[PDB]
Every structure is written in C-alpha cells, then in structure tokens.
C-alpha cells in the first residue's frame, strides 16, 4: 500500500583519457520510468514507461537541465574526491548518489533520504530528520561543513517533503493502470534428488508485482532459518519479478515440509506441499 | 521529478 519515488545516479571516471560516464535512472516503486545516459546520442532525459510520455516539453527540458546539472556536479566531485584521498589520476573511480521519498497507504509523506557514496562506500548521508548529516570519515567532514554552511539540508528537505511526494502522487495517478496494479504470484514446485537418500526441493514464485514478497520454509510448522537457500528477487523483464526458495532434505519426508508464500496481491497466504 | 535544489559539489 506504501509507495516510493527514487532517483539513482552513477558517475564513473575513465582516466588516462577523459569524459566520465554518467547514468541516471528514476523509479516509481519497482518501475523504472525515466533515464539519462551520458554515452547515448540524444543527451536528453528519456522516458522508459508508457505513462510518463504524455508529459510536455517543459517537463523534459526541465528534467534534462536538472540531470545535466547533476552530472556536472558529479564531474567536479570526481576531481575533488581524488584530491581528498591523495589518489593518483590513473585509476577509475565512482561516485554514486541516491535520493527520494516514501509515502504510506494514503500517499502522505512517510520518509525521505539523500545518500552519497565514493568507490562504493558511504561518504555522506542526510539523516532521517532531514536537518543533519552523517559523514562516514574524516575527509567527508570537509564536505559536511561546506554543506551545513550552504544550507543544503533545508533545500533537500523542501524537495523531499514537498516536490518529491507531490510528484509521486501525480505519477501514481497518471500511471494508475501500471503503478497501482498488483500481480498475484503464480506458484509451483520442483523436486530433484541429489544423493539417493537426499533430495533438493524448491518453491517457485513467478509473475508477481510488486517485488516485495515472502518465501519461507517450515517443517511440521516449525521455523527453518538454518538449512535454506534463498535467491535474490529477480526481474522477468516484462514488469514482473521471479524468486525461489530451496531446501535440502533426506528422502522420505517430503510431506514434512511446507513452503509459505506471502504477497499483497494474494487474498490469503499460500502454503504448498508435495502431491 | 528531479531535485532542482540542494545538489551541491562536495
């Protein structure tokens, strides 16, 4: 019932030569809707969901200027961090930025964030109160002081409590068909014996939306946090997601285990066992 | 909608 808008930015230095790579993508919940790629030809912000296309030229010009502005910022950042950390200019380095907002079932503001990584670790993050900063290390303190003096946090808080939420609502309504749908997971079950006396037994959840799901294993209705293999929820490429959970079990009690499937598209939990 | 404010060089 909750929802979220998030923007993801990756900036990668490709040194010895020049011109970094910048990729920005934007998501409403689990659905990508816009993107920008500095290596593509258009040099514009591009639609990636049917419902964002109907937006006007002022929107796209706007988003383009803003996204270019983000990259230029990151491009200065790469030099800057390189200096902060006494790194040479022979190595490829990475800046990452994630921001956005969460709303509840009624679409009222729930939470906001703006996080910043260098070479894949935390560099500086806006805290939950949206008024203060976490600096992961000593070099990051410099950035912190600068951002405090420049009142970055109040500006981000305006975006995160106002614009983000508002536009999330606009996107959810405009994209009603796609965004507010729930696809019930189609389930089934496979069995492959491993060593005569042993068999691996796997519970399959398919074609579900959104990505949030729960696949759990019980024996006789008892928790199995031990022997379990659980793979990351993965995209099917058609808007939905797939996942599974397997457990390794001695042959003969394949009816002493049940797999439980929880999803919001489901009326009640599904518990399955063998036939 | 992207942020149009609060994006500052580190």
């Amino acid at each position: 019932g909750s929802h979220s808008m998030r923007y993801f930015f990756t900036s990668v230095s490709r040194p010895g030569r020049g011109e970094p790579r910048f990729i920005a993508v934007g998501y409403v919940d689990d659905t990508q809707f816009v993107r920008f790629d500095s290596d593509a030809a258009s040099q514009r912000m591009e639609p990636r969901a049917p419902w964002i296309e109907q937006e006007g030229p002022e929107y796209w010009d706007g988003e383009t200027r803003k996204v270019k502005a983000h990259s230029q910022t990151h491009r200065v950042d790469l030099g800057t961090l390189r200096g902060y950390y006494n790194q040479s200019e022979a190595g490829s380095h990475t800046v990452q930025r994630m921001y956005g907002c969460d709303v509840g079932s009624d679409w009222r503001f729930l939470r906001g964030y703006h996080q910043y990584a260098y070479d894949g670790k935390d560099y500086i993050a806006l805290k939950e109160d949206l008024r203060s900063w976490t600096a992961a290390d000593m070099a990051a303190q410099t950035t912190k002081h600068k951002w405090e003096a420049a009142h970055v946090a109040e500006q981000l808080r305006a975006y995160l409590e106002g614009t983000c939420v508002e536009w999330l609502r606009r996107y959810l309504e405009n994209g009603k068909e796609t965004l507010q749908r729930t696809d019930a997971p189609k389930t089934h079950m496979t069995h492959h014996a491993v060593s005569d006396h042993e068999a691996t037994l796997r519970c399959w959840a398919l074609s579900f939306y959104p990505a949030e799901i729960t696949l759990t294993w019980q024996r006789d209705g008892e928790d199995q946090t031990q022997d379990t293999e659980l793979v990351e929820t993965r995209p099917a490429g058609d808007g939905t997601f797939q996942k599974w959970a397997a457990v390794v079990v001695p042959s003969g009690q394949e009816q002493r285990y049940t797999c439980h499937v929880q999803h919001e598209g489901l009326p009640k939990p599904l518990t399955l066992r063998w036939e | 909608e992207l942020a149009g404010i609060g994006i500052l060089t580190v």
Partner: T-cell receptor
Amino acid sequence: KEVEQNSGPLSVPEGAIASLNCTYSYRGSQSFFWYRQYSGKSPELIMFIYSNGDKEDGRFTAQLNKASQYVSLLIRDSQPSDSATYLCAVNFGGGKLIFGQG
Amino acid sequence: IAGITQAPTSQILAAGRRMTLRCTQDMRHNAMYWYRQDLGLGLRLIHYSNTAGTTGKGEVPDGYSVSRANTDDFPLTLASAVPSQTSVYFCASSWSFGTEAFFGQGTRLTVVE
C-alpha cells in the same frame, strides 16, 4: 520561458500594506526569489521561498502556491524607502534562472 | 570579504568593435550568470554556467560568447557590437543551481556607430 508580474507602476500610500504577485508556467519549478532594485542599482535579495505556504521576514511576507503557480510578496507598514522596482525570479531547471519584468 | 565584481562599470562602444566584460567571484560559488536589463523589459538571461568548465544558453544567447575556464571567472564577450546590445549587463552567481543569485554592481554599455 514565462515569468509574469503585476504591470506597474503601482502607487501605495505610506504605512499601508503593499502587495505584489507573480505567476509562472513550469509546474516543476522548485525555487522562487524576490529581489529589490533601486534605480540604476543592482538587484538585492529580499527573500527566497522553496515550500508551499508562508514565509515571514520582518515587514515582508512571501507566499507560494505551487498548485496555482503563484508567488506573492506582502509589505506590511510601508516605508517610502520601499519605493523601488520589484523583481520576481523563478528557476526553470539548472542554470535557467528567469526574471519577471518587474 | 568574499563577493562578486564586474569590470568595467561603464563603457561606450563603437559599432563593430569587440568587447569583454570581466566578472569574478571568490565565494566558491559553482553557478554563474549573465543578464541584460532594458528600460522596460526587466532582466533577461543571456548565458549561464552550473559549474567550472561548463556553460549553457539562456533566453538571449544571441550575440554573445562566454567561457568558464575556472570557478572564479565568467567573462561575457561581444564579437560584432551592434547598437541593439546597448543595455545594462549584470553578472550574478549562486552556490548551486537553483539557489539564490548574488548580483554584481552592473555595467552600463552603450553601442554607437
């Protein structure tokens, strides 16, 4: 693009509440500024506003309505030293800071 | 004390001559701007720059060059000076894109044949 203020010149008596408005096209605009310009001088910031609602600063009140594409400036208790041209600026993206006519 | 400076403050140009207005700033601001003002048309954005090294076209790029080799400076350039460019020119700067712009003192420029 399109930033439009009240057509001047306006005349307000001393001590009275004065009121300026500004309307803008872009719905995605996120930052709004009010500047004061005396004749042959440089625009000086009276105030800024990011969020829907009111912002108080002494004799001045900014008012922003994102839904109506609207910014407002309210001068309480007018001095004659407020006799000046007033500028509305809105940001349309990156470096695209656009000014009203005044 | 950190601020922003234009130069010259005043200039008379013969038409066809080329001209560069200096503008510099020690506040460590990323974003800078050139505007023109005309006796009834308010300020109109000429060029801008979000960061050292990068630039962009405003409402009236038409007529003027521009460059941003570093953070401090943002010179505005006129190739062939037409009399239609007689205006007052302002350089302004802001911390980042979308935050308050601080103006310099201005430059009164008159182009005559």
